[PDB]
Amino acid sequence: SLPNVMESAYYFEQAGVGLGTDETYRVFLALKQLTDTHPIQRCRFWGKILGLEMNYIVAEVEFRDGEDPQVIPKEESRTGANKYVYFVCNVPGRPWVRLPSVTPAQIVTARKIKKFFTGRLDAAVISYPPFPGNESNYLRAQIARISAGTHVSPLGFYQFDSYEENPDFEGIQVIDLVESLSNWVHHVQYILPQGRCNWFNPIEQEVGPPLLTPISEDLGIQNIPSWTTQLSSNLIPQYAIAVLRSNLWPGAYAFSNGKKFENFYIGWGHKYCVENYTPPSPPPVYQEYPSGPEITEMNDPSVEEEQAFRMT
Amino acid sequence: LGEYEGERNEVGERHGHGKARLPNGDTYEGSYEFGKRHGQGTYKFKNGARYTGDYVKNKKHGQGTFIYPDGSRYEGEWADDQRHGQGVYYYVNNDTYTGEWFNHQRHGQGTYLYAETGSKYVGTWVHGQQEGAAELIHLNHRYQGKFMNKNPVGPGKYVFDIGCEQHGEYRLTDTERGEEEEEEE
Amino acid sequence: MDADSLLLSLELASGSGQGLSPDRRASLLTSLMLVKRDYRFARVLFWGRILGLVADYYIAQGLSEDQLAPRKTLYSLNCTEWSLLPPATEEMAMQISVVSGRFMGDPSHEYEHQIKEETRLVSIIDQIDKAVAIIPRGALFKTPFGVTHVNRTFEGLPLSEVRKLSSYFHFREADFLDSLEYDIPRGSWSIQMERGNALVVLRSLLWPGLTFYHAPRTKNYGYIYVGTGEKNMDLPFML
C-alpha cells in the first residue's frame, strides 16, 4: 500500500522539486505510520500545501473494500470527487487528521473565494460568499480542484468513471512526452460547475471532458499555455525526466521517466489568475411586487350609489 | 353593491368605525371619514394582500404596513398612495431593504441586506436601482466606491478588518483593474 | 543565498519545495565563482528564479563592500551563461505597470501593452529586492566609514527574537535598516519553524516564492525568490 515516495523524491530533485531528502523520508515514515494504523489499500504523498503559521503534509488514501435553493448532495461512496480520503499532518510524527467529505453545493462551489491556509483545520474561513465550513473543508475543496486540474499521466498507462492499469503500455519516450501535451492525459475526473464529477438531477446536462482526455485541451488564461514542459538534466538528455509545470495551479507538477509517472503539488493551494482577484458580485437586487391593479385602491362605493341601487 | 356596518350622519355618507365589503370581494375593517378613507384601519384583499395603517383622502399616508400576495411585506412611511420616506421592505427570501423611499422606488440613502449571504449594500439609490456612491459590507471586507447598473464602477476601494485598505478600479462587468498599493489608514 | 546554500540544498530545506536540482546546484557553484572572478564582487549570492513559460531565469546578485550599494543583477537561462542584467530605475518601474502575465523564457519577447522582457526582469527583480529582501537583526553592521559590512561577529537570533517581525530587516537603503513589522499588510509575513526548530523559514505572502532561511544556532542565513514573479495584489483578500 505504501509507495516508494523516496524514488519519487529523487526524481523530484532532478527538477528542483521536493522537501529535501531527510524531510521527505520523515514524511515517508509518517505515511508508513498512517498505513499501519488504518486499513489502507493504496496511498501516495499527494503534496504539501503551504500555510501561514503551519503547513499540511497531504496524503491521498484509498482504503480496502469494506473497511473505513436546491442542495446538490455529495458523492457518499468512492465515486467522483470523494474517491480518495485525504489525511493531513503538520510536521511528521503528529497524528494524521482525516479530512471530511467534499460537498458540491457548499465546498467546491465556494471556489469563488481564494484564501490562505492558517495551518489550523479548525480555524474559521471568513470570505465572500460565507464559506460553508472551517479550514478543513476549504482544504478539501482546494485539494479536489487541484486533483481535478493537475493529476495527469501519460497517454497510455490505463485503459478507458473507472480505469485500470494498462498491461501493454510499451512506454512513450521522454522527448515525446515533453515536446507535446497530446501524450499526457488527466488521471482523475473533472469537477462540473455544480461541484460534482457525476451529474445529479436537481428536480440540462452540464458535461465535462471524459477521463481519457489529453491535457493539450486544458486551456487557458489569456492565451498562456498550460503545462509548461521541460527536460530535467539537460546536459545528459538521454537520462532526462519529463517535467510538467501546470501554470494553472502553481506548485502542481507531473513527472514521468517514459514508463512510470507520479504527481505532486507543493504550492499554496490556489489557482493562478492573470487578473487580480475580483470578489464575486452579490446576487441581483430583487424588486418589489409590481404596482398592478391586484393590490390597488379599494374604491369603496358612495352612499349616493347605494341609494341608487336601493331604489329597486 | 356590497355591504357595510357602521355609523354615519344624516347627510354624511360614512364617518364612523366598522367593517365594509365591496362589490369586488375585498373587505375593510377600521376608520373612515365622509364618503372616503381617513385614519387607522385594516385592509384585507381577496388576493391575500393586506395593509394596516393610516389614510388621509383615499390614499396610504403616514406610518403603516403592507403584506403583498407573493409573501413580501413592508412597513414604514407612505405618501400619495405610494411608499415614501423612511421604511423597511422584506422580500420573499428574507432579504430586506431599510431606507428612504420615493414613489414606490428605492431612492436616497438606504441599506439592503443580502440575507442569503449576510452582506449589506449601504448607500444611494436611484429609482429602484443600485447607483451612486455606496458601501458594500461583507463579513470582513467593506467595498467603498461608485455603483452603476447594479455593478461596481470607478476607482477604489476596499477596507479590510486586518488593518489595511486596497485601492483599485472597476472597468468591465464585475472586473477589477490592476490593483494599486495598500494604504495604512 | 550564498554558496553555502549550493553545497547543500538549503533552498528545499525551507519546505517551500522549489529550488535547484543538483545539476543546477553544481553548475551554479562553478558559475557564481566565475562570476565573482569576472565581476569583482565581494560576494555573489544566488538571487533566485523567475519561473517562465518557456525557460526559467536563474538570477544572481553581486554584492559590494558596501553591501547596501545598488546591487548588480545577473541573469542566466542555462545557469552557467551569466550575463550582466542592466540596473533598474523609476521610469522602468513605471513602464511595466500596464503589463500582466507570466514571464517568457526568451528575454527578447515583446508586449504590445513595446516592452522588452528584459525590462520586466530588471523591474520585477528590483521590486522584489526593495519589498521582500530579508536581513536578520544584527547581521549587518553600519561601519563608521559610511559603509555597511557583514557583522562578522553576528550570533543567530535568540528563539525569543525568532518569532518577532522586528528581528528582520529590509535589505535596502534606509541598526540602520527598516524592520518588517511596518511592511503592510500586517499579516503579510508568515513565520514557521522546520527541522526541529533549528530552522526559521520566513516566506513573503505579497511576493510568493520568497523563502528566507535562518539557523538561530549560527549565522547561516539567506533569502531566495523562486516563484512566478508577480505581486500578490490579492493579499488583503487572502489574509
Grid cell listed for A44: 501516495
| A129 upstream amide cis, omega within 30 of 0 | yes
Strand C43-50 with C221-227, pairing: parallel
What subunits make at least 3 CB pairs under 8 angstroms with A? B, C
DSSP string, C17-60: -B---HHHHHHHHHHHHHHHHHS--SEEEEEEEE--SS--EEEE
Measure in Å the smallest separation between the Cα of A18 and chain C Cα atoms: 5
What type of residue is B52?
T
Q: Where are the beta strands (DSSP E) in chain C?
A: 43-50, 57-63, 72-76, 83-84, 110-111, 115-116, 134-136, 140-143, 147-150, 168-170, 189-194, 199-204, 210-214, 221-227
Contacts of A268 in chain C (CB under 8 A): 208
Cβ-proximal residues to A209 (8 Å cutoff; 6+ apart), any chain: A186, A190, A217
The Cα A252–Cα A268 span in angstroms is 10
C23·A232 Cβ contact <8 A: yes
DSSP A279: P
Per-position b or e across C49-82, b if 16+ CB within 10 A of its CB: bbbbbebbbbbbbbbbeebbeebbbbbbbebbeb
Contacts of A23 in chain C (CB under 8 A): 13, 15, 194-195
Chain B CB within 8 Å of residue A22 CB: no
Measure in Å the smallest separation between the Cα of B169 and chain C Cα atoms: 13
- Residue in chain A closest to C236 (alpha carbons) equals A115
Q: What is the dihedral of CA B11, B15, B20, B26, to 10 degrees?
A: 110
Contact yes or no for A296/A278 (Cβ under 8 A): no
Q: Where are the beta strands (DSSP E) in A92-245?
A: 97-98, 152-154, 158-159, 164-165, 184-186, 228-231, 242-245
- CB-hemisphere CA count at 13 Å for C6? 22
A302·B139 Cβ contact <8 A: no
Grid cell listed for C3: 554558496
- Ramachandran class of B145: left when φ > 0, alpha when ψ lies in -120 to 50, beta otherwise: left
What is the resolution of the experimental data for this entry, in Å? Answer: 3.6
Among C164, C166, C171, smallest CA distance to C182 is for C166
How many CB atoms within 10 Å of residue A305? Answer: 12
Burial label, A233 (beta-carbon count in 10 A; 0-12, 13-18, 19+): middle
Chain A CB within 8 Å of residue C9 CB: yes
Measure in Å the smallest separation between the Cα of B127 and chain C Cα atoms: 32
Contacts of A22 in chain C (CB under 8 A): 195
Angle between helices A21-37 and A5-13 (to 10 degrees): 160
The Cα C207–Cα C214 span in angstroms is 19
Per-position b or e across C116-127, b if 16+ CB within 10 A of its CB: bbbbbbbbbbbb
Host H or E run for residue A28 = helix A21-37
The Cα A117–Cα A203 span in angstroms is 36
Grid cell listed for C210: 520568497
How many CB atoms within 10 Å of residue A283? Answer: 14
Contacts of B136 in chain C (CB under 8 A): none
State CA A111 to chain mean position distance: 10
- CB-hemisphere CA count at 13 Å for C160? 0
| C196 upstream amide cis, omega within 30 of 0 | no
